[PDB]
CSV table of C-alpha atoms in Angstrom, one decimal:
chain,number,residue,atom,x,y,z
A,1,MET,CA,82.0,117.4,160.7
A,2,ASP,CA,80.6,113.9,160.6
A,3,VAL,CA,81.7,113.4,156.9
A,4,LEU,CA,85.2,114.7,157.5
A,5,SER,CA,85.6,112.4,160.6
A,6,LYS,CA,85.1,109.2,158.6
A,7,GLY,CA,88.5,107.5,158.2
A,8,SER,CA,87.7,104.4,156.2
A,9,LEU,CA,86.1,103.7,152.8
A,10,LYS,CA,83.4,101.6,154.6
A,11,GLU,CA,82.5,104.4,156.9
A,12,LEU,CA,82.5,107.0,154.2
A,13,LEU,CA,80.2,104.9,152.0
A,14,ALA,CA,78.0,104.0,154.9
A,15,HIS,CA,77.6,107.7,155.8
A,16,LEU,CA,76.8,108.7,152.2
A,17,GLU,CA,74.0,106.1,152.2
A,18,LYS,CA,72.3,107.6,155.3
A,19,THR,CA,72.8,111.3,154.3
A,20,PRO,CA,70.3,113.0,152.1
A,21,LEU,CA,71.3,115.4,149.3
A,22,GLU,CA,69.9,118.3,151.4
A,23,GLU,CA,73.0,118.2,153.7
A,24,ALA,CA,75.3,118.3,150.7
A,25,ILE,CA,73.8,121.6,149.4
A,26,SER,CA,73.4,124.9,151.3
A,27,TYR,CA,70.9,127.7,151.3
A,28,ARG,CA,73.4,130.5,151.7
A,29,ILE,CA,74.2,132.6,148.6
A,30,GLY,CA,77.9,133.1,149.6
A,31,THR,CA,80.2,134.7,147.0
A,32,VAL,CA,81.4,134.0,143.5
A,33,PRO,CA,84.6,131.8,143.5
A,34,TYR,CA,87.9,132.4,141.7
A,35,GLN,CA,88.3,135.9,143.0
A,36,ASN,CA,91.6,137.5,144.1
A,37,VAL,CA,90.8,138.9,147.5
A,38,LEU,CA,92.6,140.5,150.5
A,39,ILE,CA,91.7,139.0,153.9
A,40,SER,CA,92.7,140.1,157.4
A,41,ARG,CA,95.3,138.0,159.3
A,42,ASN,CA,96.3,140.2,162.2
A,43,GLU,CA,98.1,137.2,163.9
A,44,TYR,CA,101.0,137.7,161.5
A,45,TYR,CA,100.9,140.7,159.3
A,46,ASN,CA,99.6,144.3,159.6
A,47,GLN,CA,98.9,144.4,155.8
A,48,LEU,CA,96.0,142.5,154.3
A,49,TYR,CA,96.8,138.9,153.1
A,50,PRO,CA,96.1,137.9,149.5
A,51,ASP,CA,94.2,134.7,148.7
A,52,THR,CA,91.9,133.2,146.0
A,53,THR,CA,88.4,132.0,146.8
A,54,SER,CA,87.8,128.4,145.7
A,55,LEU,CA,85.0,125.8,145.7
A,56,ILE,CA,86.8,123.8,148.4
A,57,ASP,CA,87.2,126.6,150.9
A,58,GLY,CA,84.5,125.3,153.2
A,59,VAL,CA,82.2,128.2,152.7
A,60,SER,CA,79.0,128.2,150.5
A,61,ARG,CA,79.5,129.6,147.0
A,62,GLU,CA,77.1,130.2,144.1
A,63,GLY,CA,76.8,127.3,141.7
A,64,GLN,CA,74.9,126.6,138.5
A,65,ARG,CA,71.8,124.4,138.3
A,66,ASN,CA,73.2,121.9,135.7
A,67,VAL,CA,74.5,118.4,136.4
A,68,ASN,CA,78.0,119.7,137.0
A,69,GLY,CA,77.0,122.1,139.7
A,70,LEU,CA,75.3,119.3,141.7
A,71,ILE,CA,78.3,116.9,141.3
A,72,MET,CA,80.7,119.7,142.3
A,73,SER,CA,78.6,120.5,145.4
A,74,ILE,CA,78.7,116.8,146.5
A,75,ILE,CA,82.5,116.6,146.1
A,76,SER,CA,82.9,119.8,148.0
A,77,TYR,CA,80.8,118.5,150.8
A,78,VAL,CA,83.0,115.4,151.0
A,79,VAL,CA,86.3,117.2,151.0
A,80,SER,CA,85.5,120.5,152.7
A,81,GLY,CA,82.4,119.8,154.8
A,82,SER,CA,80.2,122.4,153.1
A,83,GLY,CA,78.4,122.6,149.8
A,84,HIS,CA,77.3,125.2,147.3
A,85,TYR,CA,74.1,127.2,146.5
A,86,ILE,CA,72.2,125.5,143.7
A,87,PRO,CA,68.8,127.3,143.4
A,88,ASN,CA,65.6,125.2,143.6
A,89,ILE,CA,66.9,121.7,143.2
A,90,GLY,CA,63.5,120.2,144.0
A,91,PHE,CA,62.1,117.9,146.6
A,92,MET,CA,62.5,114.8,144.4
A,93,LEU,CA,66.3,115.0,144.5
A,94,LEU,CA,66.7,116.3,148.0
A,95,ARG,CA,65.2,113.2,149.6
A,96,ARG,CA,67.6,110.9,147.8
A,97,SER,CA,70.8,110.1,149.5
A,98,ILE,CA,74.2,111.1,148.1
A,99,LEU,CA,75.2,107.6,147.1
A,100,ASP,CA,72.1,107.1,145.0
A,101,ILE,CA,72.9,110.3,143.1
A,102,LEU,CA,76.4,108.9,142.5
A,103,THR,CA,75.7,105.2,141.9
A,104,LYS,CA,72.1,104.7,140.9
A,105,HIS,CA,69.9,105.2,137.8
A,106,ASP,CA,66.6,105.9,139.6
A,107,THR,CA,67.3,109.5,140.4
A,108,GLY,CA,66.3,110.8,137.0
A,109,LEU,CA,69.6,112.6,136.6
A,110,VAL,CA,71.8,112.1,133.5
A,111,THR,CA,75.4,112.1,134.9
A,112,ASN,CA,76.9,111.0,131.6
A,113,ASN,CA,78.7,113.4,129.3
A,114,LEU,CA,80.8,114.5,132.3
A,115,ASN,CA,84.4,115.7,131.9
A,116,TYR,CA,86.6,114.8,134.9
A,117,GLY,CA,89.4,117.1,133.8
A,118,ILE,CA,87.0,120.1,133.8
A,119,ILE,CA,85.5,119.2,137.1
A,120,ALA,CA,89.0,118.7,138.7
A,121,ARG,CA,90.1,122.1,137.4
A,122,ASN,CA,87.0,123.8,138.9
A,123,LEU,CA,87.6,122.1,142.3
A,124,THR,CA,91.2,123.1,142.4
A,125,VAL,CA,92.7,119.6,142.6
A,126,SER,CA,96.2,121.1,142.7
A,127,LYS,CA,95.4,122.7,146.1
A,128,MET,CA,93.8,119.7,147.9
A,129,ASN,CA,95.9,117.3,150.0
A,130,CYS,CA,96.2,113.6,149.8
A,131,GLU,CA,93.0,112.8,151.7
A,132,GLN,CA,91.0,115.3,149.8
A,133,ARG,CA,92.4,114.0,146.5
A,134,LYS,CA,91.6,110.4,147.5
A,135,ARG,CA,88.0,111.3,148.3
A,136,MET,CA,87.5,113.1,145.0
A,137,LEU,CA,88.7,110.1,143.1
A,138,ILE,CA,86.3,107.9,145.0
A,139,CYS,CA,83.4,110.0,143.7
A,140,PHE,CA,84.8,110.0,140.2
A,141,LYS,CA,85.1,106.2,140.2
A,142,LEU,CA,81.5,105.7,141.4
A,143,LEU,CA,80.2,108.0,138.7
A,144,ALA,CA,82.3,106.4,136.0
A,145,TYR,CA,81.3,102.8,136.8
A,146,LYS,CA,77.6,103.6,137.0
A,147,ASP,CA,77.5,105.2,133.5
A,148,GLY,CA,79.9,102.6,132.0
A,149,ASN,CA,82.8,105.1,131.6
A,150,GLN,CA,85.6,103.1,133.2
A,151,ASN,CA,87.8,103.9,130.2
A,152,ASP,CA,87.4,107.7,130.7
A,153,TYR,CA,88.3,107.3,134.3
A,154,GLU,CA,91.5,105.4,133.4
A,155,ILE,CA,92.3,108.0,130.7
A,156,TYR,CA,92.0,110.8,133.3
A,157,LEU,CA,94.3,109.0,135.7
A,158,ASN,CA,96.9,108.4,133.0
A,159,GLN,CA,97.1,112.1,132.2
A,160,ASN,CA,97.5,112.9,135.9
A,161,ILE,CA,100.4,110.8,137.2
A,162,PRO,CA,100.3,112.3,140.8
A,163,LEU,CA,96.7,111.3,141.1
A,164,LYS,CA,97.4,107.8,139.7
A,165,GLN,CA,99.8,107.0,142.5
A,166,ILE,CA,97.2,107.6,145.3
A,167,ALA,CA,94.2,106.2,143.4
A,168,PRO,CA,91.8,104.2,145.5
A,169,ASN,CA,92.1,100.4,145.2
A,170,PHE,CA,88.4,99.5,145.3
A,171,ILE,CA,86.0,98.5,142.5
A,172,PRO,CA,82.5,99.9,142.8
A,173,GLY,CA,80.6,96.7,142.0
A,174,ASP,CA,82.6,94.3,144.3
A,175,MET,CA,82.1,94.2,148.0
A,176,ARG,CA,85.3,92.4,148.7
A,177,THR,CA,87.4,95.4,147.6
A,178,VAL,CA,85.5,97.7,150.0
A,179,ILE,CA,86.0,95.6,153.1
A,180,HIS,CA,89.7,94.9,152.5
A,181,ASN,CA,90.6,98.5,151.6
A,182,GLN,CA,93.1,100.1,154.0
A,183,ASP,CA,92.9,103.8,152.9
A,184,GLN,CA,92.9,106.5,155.5
A,185,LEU,CA,90.5,109.4,154.6
A,186,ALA,CA,90.0,111.2,157.9
A,187,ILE,CA,90.5,115.0,157.5
A,188,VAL,CA,89.5,115.7,161.1
A,189,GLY,CA,89.8,113.6,164.3
A,190,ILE,CA,90.5,113.7,168.0
A,191,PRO,CA,94.2,114.4,168.3
A,192,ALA,CA,96.7,113.2,171.0
A,193,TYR,CA,97.6,116.1,173.2
A,194,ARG,CA,95.9,119.2,171.7
A,195,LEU,CA,96.3,121.8,169.0
A,196,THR,CA,96.8,125.5,169.6
A,197,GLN,CA,93.8,127.9,169.1
A,198,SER,CA,95.7,129.9,166.5
A,199,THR,CA,94.7,131.1,163.0
A,200,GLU,CA,96.2,130.0,159.7
A,201,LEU,CA,97.1,132.0,156.6
A,202,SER,CA,95.0,130.3,153.9
A,203,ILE,CA,91.2,130.3,153.7
A,204,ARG,CA,91.3,126.5,153.3
A,205,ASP,CA,93.8,126.0,156.1
A,206,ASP,CA,92.0,128.3,158.6
A,207,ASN,CA,88.6,126.7,157.8
A,208,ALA,CA,90.0,123.2,158.1
A,209,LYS,CA,91.6,124.1,161.4
A,210,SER,CA,88.2,125.4,162.7
A,211,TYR,CA,86.7,122.0,161.9
A,212,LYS,CA,89.5,120.1,163.8
A,213,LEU,CA,89.2,122.3,166.9
A,214,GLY,CA,85.4,122.1,167.1
A,215,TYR,CA,85.3,118.3,166.5
A,216,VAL,CA,86.1,117.5,170.1
A,217,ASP,CA,83.2,119.6,171.4
A,218,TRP,CA,80.9,118.4,168.6
A,219,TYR,CA,81.8,114.8,169.5
A,220,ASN,CA,80.7,115.2,173.2
A,221,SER,CA,77.6,117.4,172.8
A,222,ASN,CA,75.8,116.3,169.6
A,223,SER,CA,73.8,113.2,170.7
A,224,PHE,CA,71.3,115.0,172.9
A,225,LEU,CA,70.8,118.1,170.7
A,226,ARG,CA,70.3,116.1,167.6
A,227,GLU,CA,67.9,113.7,169.4
A,228,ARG,CA,65.7,116.5,170.6
A,229,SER,CA,65.0,117.6,167.0
A,230,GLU,CA,64.9,114.0,165.6
A,231,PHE,CA,62.2,112.9,168.1
A,232,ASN,CA,58.6,113.2,166.7
A,233,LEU,CA,59.7,113.6,163.1
A,234,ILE,CA,59.9,111.5,159.9
A,235,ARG,CA,63.3,111.2,158.0
A,236,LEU,CA,63.6,112.5,154.4
B,6,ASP,CA,96.9,140.1,185.4
B,7,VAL,CA,94.2,138.0,186.9
B,8,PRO,CA,91.2,140.0,185.6
B,9,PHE,CA,92.6,140.3,182.1
B,10,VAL,CA,93.5,136.6,181.8
B,11,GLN,CA,90.0,135.5,182.7
B,12,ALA,CA,88.4,137.9,180.2
B,13,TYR,CA,90.9,137.1,177.5
B,14,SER,CA,90.4,133.4,178.0
B,15,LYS,CA,86.7,133.7,177.7
B,16,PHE,CA,87.1,135.9,174.6
B,17,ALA,CA,89.8,134.0,172.8
B,18,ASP,CA,89.4,130.4,174.2
B,19,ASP,CA,93.2,130.8,174.9
B,20,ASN,CA,95.2,132.4,177.8
B,21,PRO,CA,97.4,135.4,177.0
B,22,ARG,CA,100.8,134.2,175.7
B,23,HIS,CA,104.3,135.6,176.5
B,24,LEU,CA,106.6,136.4,173.5
B,25,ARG,CA,103.4,136.5,171.4
B,26,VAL,CA,101.2,139.6,170.6
B,27,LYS,CA,97.7,139.1,171.9
B,28,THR,CA,95.3,139.9,169.0
B,29,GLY,CA,92.1,138.1,170.1
B,30,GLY,CA,92.5,134.7,168.5
B,31,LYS,CA,89.8,133.2,166.3
B,32,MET,CA,87.1,135.5,167.6
B,33,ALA,CA,89.1,138.5,166.4
B,34,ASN,CA,89.7,136.9,163.0
B,35,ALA,CA,86.0,136.1,162.5
B,36,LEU,CA,84.8,139.6,163.6
B,37,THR,CA,87.3,141.4,161.3
B,38,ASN,CA,86.3,139.4,158.2
B,39,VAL,CA,82.6,139.7,158.7
B,40,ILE,CA,83.0,143.5,159.1
B,41,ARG,CA,84.6,143.6,155.7
B,42,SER,CA,81.9,141.4,154.2
B,43,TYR,CA,79.2,143.8,155.5
B,44,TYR,CA,80.6,146.8,153.7
B,45,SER,CA,80.5,145.5,150.1
B,46,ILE,CA,79.3,142.5,148.1
B,47,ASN,CA,82.8,142.5,146.4
B,48,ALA,CA,84.3,141.6,149.8
B,49,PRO,CA,84.5,137.8,150.1
B,50,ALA,CA,82.7,135.4,152.5
B,51,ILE,CA,85.5,133.6,154.4
B,52,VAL,CA,84.3,132.6,157.8
B,53,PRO,CA,82.5,129.2,157.8
B,54,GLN,CA,79.2,128.6,159.5
B,55,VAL,CA,80.6,126.2,162.1
C,14,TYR,CA,52.1,125.0,182.8
C,15,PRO,CA,55.2,123.8,180.9
C,16,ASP,CA,57.7,126.2,179.4
C,17,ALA,CA,59.1,125.8,175.9
C,18,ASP,CA,62.4,124.3,177.3
C,19,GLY,CA,60.7,121.8,179.7
C,20,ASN,CA,60.7,124.0,182.8
C,21,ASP,CA,57.5,124.2,185.0
C,22,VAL,CA,56.1,127.7,185.5
C,23,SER,CA,53.8,128.3,188.5
C,24,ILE,CA,51.3,131.1,188.4
C,25,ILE,CA,50.1,132.0,191.9
C,26,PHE,CA,48.8,135.0,193.9
C,27,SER,CA,51.8,136.4,195.8
C,28,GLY,CA,53.2,139.7,197.0
C,29,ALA,CA,55.0,142.2,194.9
C,30,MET,CA,58.1,142.4,197.1
C,31,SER,CA,58.2,138.7,198.0
C,32,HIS,CA,58.0,137.9,194.3
C,33,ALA,CA,60.7,140.5,193.3
C,34,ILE,CA,63.2,139.3,196.0
C,35,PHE,CA,62.7,135.5,195.4
C,36,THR,CA,62.9,135.6,191.6
C,37,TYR,CA,65.9,137.9,191.7
C,38,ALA,CA,67.7,135.4,194.0
C,39,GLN,CA,66.8,132.7,191.5
C,40,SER,CA,68.3,134.6,188.6
C,41,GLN,CA,71.5,135.2,190.5
C,42,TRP,CA,72.1,131.5,191.4
C,43,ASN,CA,71.1,130.4,187.9
C,44,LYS,CA,73.9,132.1,186.0
C,45,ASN,CA,76.3,130.0,188.0
C,46,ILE,CA,74.6,126.8,187.2
C,47,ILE,CA,76.1,125.3,184.0
C,48,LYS,CA,76.1,122.1,182.1
C,49,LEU,CA,78.8,119.4,182.8
C,50,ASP,CA,80.2,119.7,179.2
C,51,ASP,CA,80.7,123.5,179.6
C,52,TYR,CA,82.4,122.8,183.0
C,53,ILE,CA,84.8,120.3,181.4
C,54,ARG,CA,85.7,122.9,178.7
C,55,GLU,CA,86.6,125.5,181.4
C,56,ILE,CA,88.6,122.9,183.3
C,57,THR,CA,90.5,121.8,180.2
C,58,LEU,CA,91.7,125.4,179.6
C,59,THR,CA,93.2,125.6,183.1
C,60,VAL,CA,95.1,122.3,183.0
C,61,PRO,CA,98.2,121.7,180.8
C,62,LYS,CA,97.8,120.8,177.1
C,63,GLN,CA,98.3,117.0,177.6
C,64,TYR,CA,96.1,116.6,180.7
C,65,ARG,CA,92.4,115.8,180.4
C,66,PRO,CA,89.6,115.3,182.8
C,67,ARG,CA,88.1,111.8,183.4
C,68,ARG,CA,84.6,111.2,182.1
C,69,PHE,CA,81.6,111.0,184.4
C,70,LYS,CA,78.6,108.6,184.1
C,71,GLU,CA,76.5,108.7,181.0
C,72,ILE,CA,73.5,110.1,182.8
C,73,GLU,CA,75.6,113.0,184.2
C,74,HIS,CA,76.9,113.9,180.8
C,75,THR,CA,73.4,114.1,179.2
C,76,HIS,CA,71.5,115.8,182.0
C,77,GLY,CA,74.2,116.9,184.6
C,78,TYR,CA,74.6,120.4,185.9
C,79,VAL,CA,77.1,121.9,188.4
C,80,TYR,CA,77.2,125.1,190.4
C,81,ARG,CA,80.5,127.0,190.1
C,82,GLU,CA,82.0,130.3,191.1
C,83,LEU,CA,84.5,132.0,188.8
C,84,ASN,CA,85.9,134.5,191.4
C,85,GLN,CA,89.5,133.7,192.1
C,86,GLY,CA,90.1,136.5,194.7
C,87,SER,CA,93.2,138.3,195.8
C,88,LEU,CA,95.7,138.1,198.6
C,89,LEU,CA,96.5,141.9,198.5
C,90,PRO,CA,94.3,143.0,201.4
C,91,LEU,CA,96.2,140.6,203.7
C,92,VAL,CA,99.5,141.5,202.0
C,93,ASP,CA,99.1,145.3,201.8
C,94,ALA,CA,100.2,146.4,205.3
C,95,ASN,CA,103.2,147.3,207.4
C,96,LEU,CA,104.6,143.8,207.8
C,97,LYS,CA,107.6,144.9,209.9
C,98,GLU,CA,106.3,143.6,213.2
C,99,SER,CA,104.3,140.6,212.0
C,100,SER,CA,107.2,139.3,209.8
C,101,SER,CA,109.1,137.8,212.8
C,102,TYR,CA,106.0,135.8,213.9
C,103,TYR,CA,105.4,134.7,210.3
C,104,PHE,CA,109.0,133.6,209.8
C,105,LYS,CA,108.8,131.3,212.9
C,106,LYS,CA,105.7,129.6,211.5
C,107,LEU,CA,107.5,129.3,208.1
C,108,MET,CA,110.5,127.5,209.7
C,109,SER,CA,108.2,125.0,211.5
C,110,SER,CA,106.3,124.0,208.4
C,111,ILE,CA,109.1,121.9,207.0
C,112,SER,CA,110.0,118.9,209.2
C,113,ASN,CA,113.3,119.6,211.1
C,114,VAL,CA,116.2,117.2,211.4
D,12,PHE,CA,131.6,123.4,213.7
D,13,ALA,CA,128.6,121.2,214.5
D,14,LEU,CA,126.9,121.5,211.2
D,15,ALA,CA,124.1,118.9,210.9
D,16,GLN,CA,123.3,117.3,207.6
D,17,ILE,CA,119.8,117.7,206.1
D,18,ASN,CA,118.9,114.7,204.0
D,19,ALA,CA,115.5,115.8,202.6
D,20,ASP,CA,115.4,112.7,200.3
D,21,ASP,CA,112.1,111.2,201.2
D,22,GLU,CA,110.4,114.5,200.9
D,23,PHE,CA,110.7,114.5,197.1
D,24,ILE,CA,108.8,112.1,194.9
D,25,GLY,CA,110.9,112.3,191.8
D,26,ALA,CA,111.1,116.1,191.3
D,27,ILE,CA,107.8,117.0,193.1
D,28,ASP,CA,107.6,118.0,196.8
D,29,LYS,CA,104.0,117.1,197.8
D,30,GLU,CA,104.0,119.0,201.1
D,31,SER,CA,105.3,122.2,199.6
D,32,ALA,CA,102.9,122.0,196.6
D,33,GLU,CA,99.9,121.4,198.8
D,34,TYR,CA,100.9,124.2,201.2
D,35,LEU,CA,101.1,126.8,198.4
D,36,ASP,CA,97.7,125.7,197.2
D,37,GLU,CA,95.8,126.6,200.4
D,38,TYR,CA,96.7,130.3,199.8
D,39,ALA,CA,94.3,130.3,196.8
D,40,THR,CA,91.5,129.2,199.2
D,41,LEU,CA,92.6,132.0,201.5
D,42,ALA,CA,92.5,134.5,198.7
D,43,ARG,CA,88.9,133.5,197.8
D,44,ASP,CA,87.8,133.9,201.4
D,45,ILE,CA,89.4,137.4,201.8
D,46,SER,CA,87.5,138.8,198.8
D,47,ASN,CA,84.3,137.0,199.8
D,48,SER,CA,84.4,138.3,203.4
D,49,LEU,CA,85.4,141.9,202.4
D,50,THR,CA,82.5,142.3,199.9
D,51,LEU,CA,79.9,140.8,202.2
D,52,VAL,CA,80.9,143.2,205.0
D,53,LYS,CA,80.8,146.2,202.6
D,54,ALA,CA,77.4,145.3,201.4
D,55,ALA,CA,76.0,144.5,204.9
D,56,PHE,CA,77.4,147.6,206.6
D,57,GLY,CA,78.0,150.2,203.9
D,58,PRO,CA,79.9,153.4,204.7
D,59,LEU,CA,81.0,153.6,208.4
D,60,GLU,CA,80.8,156.7,210.5
D,61,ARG,CA,82.2,157.2,214.0
E,17,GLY,CA,74.9,63.6,160.3
E,18,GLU,CA,78.3,64.0,162.0
E,19,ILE,CA,79.1,67.4,163.5
E,20,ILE,CA,82.2,69.1,162.3
E,21,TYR,CA,81.6,72.7,163.5
E,22,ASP,CA,79.2,73.8,166.2
E,23,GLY,CA,80.9,76.8,167.8
E,24,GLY,CA,83.6,77.0,170.4
E,25,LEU,CA,85.5,79.3,172.7
E,26,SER,CA,85.3,82.8,171.2
E,27,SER,CA,88.1,85.3,171.6
E,28,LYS,CA,87.2,88.8,172.6
E,29,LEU,CA,89.4,91.7,171.5
E,30,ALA,CA,88.7,94.2,174.3
E,31,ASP,CA,88.2,94.0,178.1
E,32,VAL,CA,86.1,97.0,179.0
E,33,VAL,CA,86.4,97.7,182.7
E,34,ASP,CA,82.9,98.8,183.7
E,35,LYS,CA,84.1,100.6,186.8
E,36,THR,CA,85.8,103.9,187.6
E,37,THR,CA,89.6,103.4,187.7
E,38,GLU,CA,92.1,105.7,189.3
E,39,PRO,CA,94.8,106.9,187.0
E,40,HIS,CA,97.6,104.4,186.3
E,41,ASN,CA,100.6,103.9,184.1
E,42,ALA,CA,101.4,101.0,181.7
E,43,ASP,CA,101.4,97.5,183.1
E,44,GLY,CA,101.2,94.2,181.2
E,45,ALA,CA,102.9,93.8,177.9
E,46,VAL,CA,104.4,97.3,178.4
E,47,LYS,CA,105.7,98.1,181.9
E,48,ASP,CA,106.5,101.7,182.7
E,49,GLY,CA,109.7,102.2,184.7
E,50,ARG,CA,108.8,105.8,185.6
E,51,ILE,CA,107.3,106.7,188.9
E,52,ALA,CA,103.5,106.3,189.4
E,53,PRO,CA,101.4,109.5,189.0
E,54,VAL,CA,101.6,111.5,192.2
E,55,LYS,CA,98.3,112.0,193.9
E,56,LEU,CA,98.2,115.6,195.0
E,57,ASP,CA,95.6,116.8,197.5
E,58,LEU,CA,95.0,120.1,195.8
E,59,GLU,CA,92.0,122.5,195.4
E,60,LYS,CA,90.9,122.3,199.0
E,61,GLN,CA,87.7,124.2,200.0
E,62,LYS,CA,87.9,124.8,203.8
E,63,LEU,CA,91.5,126.0,204.6
E,64,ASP,CA,93.2,123.2,206.5
E,65,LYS,CA,96.9,123.1,207.6
E,66,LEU,CA,97.5,126.8,206.7
């Protein structure tokens, strides 16, 4: 909820600094992705409604323990609000924040030898919207600049013209580009008037709608409940 | 319709609507999908934790 | 001694019937005592889609509670009768409600 | 023959009649009292025998 | 040495009214020509005027 509410590059990067990797990953096994399933949408049809499970559905799915699984889990958290199930990551990586995993060399993780085309295919980039596409490219650029693979990032953008049009305009090493950036990246937010409490056809659309509807209640009643648990505890 | 509207509003977070079948809203959708998930592992997990 | 959720529990020597009646009364009033945020949610469902309630003080949002009754009632007991004779008297009051030229 | 004219212009604020809107609302309070009184008498007195 | 900059009058973006305000329409740069919101005395508890 908090990650999807951020609407600026500054706010998104600030949030990733304060958020440990534990929030990105999940401890629920979920189901295997890329499965043609029939779900129930009784609002519209009596028959079952076909759909395909993906990594950006907003529901935890099983993921491998390699470097790609950890990166895919982080990107899913940014664009869908929920991560995947990577078994036994270890306390050493869980305490580190998301940005250090993306943009630092002290994590002990070798993020080189990463193919952005393969990762984009696995995350179903063809199904995500402009804001989700923009957030995914931000993670790619941070990973590319840390490992000195700026050429491979440019090659990926050249092959994908639609992604090149909406590419973020910041440079990871320069602070001036971050402050002057005018991108809008807010998936959820408090809307003028309201939105009907009705279901949607797709798994992604319905889960995204559930986040928007619950944001208003989460905004008002989160400070006290979080503080009660935060008090008398040490942060990871 | 006063007793039904109060119960449906609590159940569905929405009042009953004219020219629109009342199915139970998001609560009905979540309940129907978790029932499917309970039956078999092959059934997907669709409802988010939020 | 303190309860897990911050309430204070008093253990005393008291009667069986006096304890049963007093604590049952407490449980009946308590289910109608709800947080301010939950009260706002119920109000928002009744008002139109664009209307919203005004926010209270910050103290009242964090620790505020309100007693509410959800029973709306019915006018049928008054309505359900042979209104033939009382209709004329009610019509006279109806005509007087609106100011007359 | 002597048909008076009813103005009723100052009664409406735009398209809203305050006096009529407020008069209709007090019936909801009356409905609450009717149910409250009826249930309290039934519990206090129970079945009645003559 | 000579003083070139030492501060000055600082412009504040927002004026946050720290008091409860009754509902109002647009006034200032944008003036609303529609009628002011109608204050309706609804949801009475004791039944008056009925």
